[PDB]
Amino acid sequence: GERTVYCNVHKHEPLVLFCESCDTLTCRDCQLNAHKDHQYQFLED
Amino acid sequence: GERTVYCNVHKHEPLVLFCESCDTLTCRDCQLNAHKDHQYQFLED
Ligand SMILES: [Zn+2]
Ligand SMILES: [Zn+2]
Ligand SMILES: [Zn+2]
Ligand SMILES: [Zn+2]
DSSP: OOOOOBOSSSTTSBOOEEETTTTEEEOHHHHHTTTTTSOEEETTO | OOOSOBOSSSTTOBOOEEETTTTEEEOHHHHHTTTTTOOEEETTO
């Protein structure tokens, strides 16, 4: 049962996005905070 | 640093792939073994 992969920083948040500006996997909190204004896509997208 | 994310199964393997069949982040070993023949793309593409 290792379906969900979580953020290294926000431990209970699933990594569901990829920040293109940083070539970095991100969770919702990462994308709205440290990565605000960066270009991104949800992984499924 | 905390940006590179490593697989929880294959400890020294980074999650660089996304298995489209399962909508799940995978590392090289995950993709070739547990996800054999599933559709995938490297995150960077
Ligand atoms: Zn995060
Ligand atoms: Zn970013
Ligand atoms: Zn798969
Ligand atoms: Zn793996």
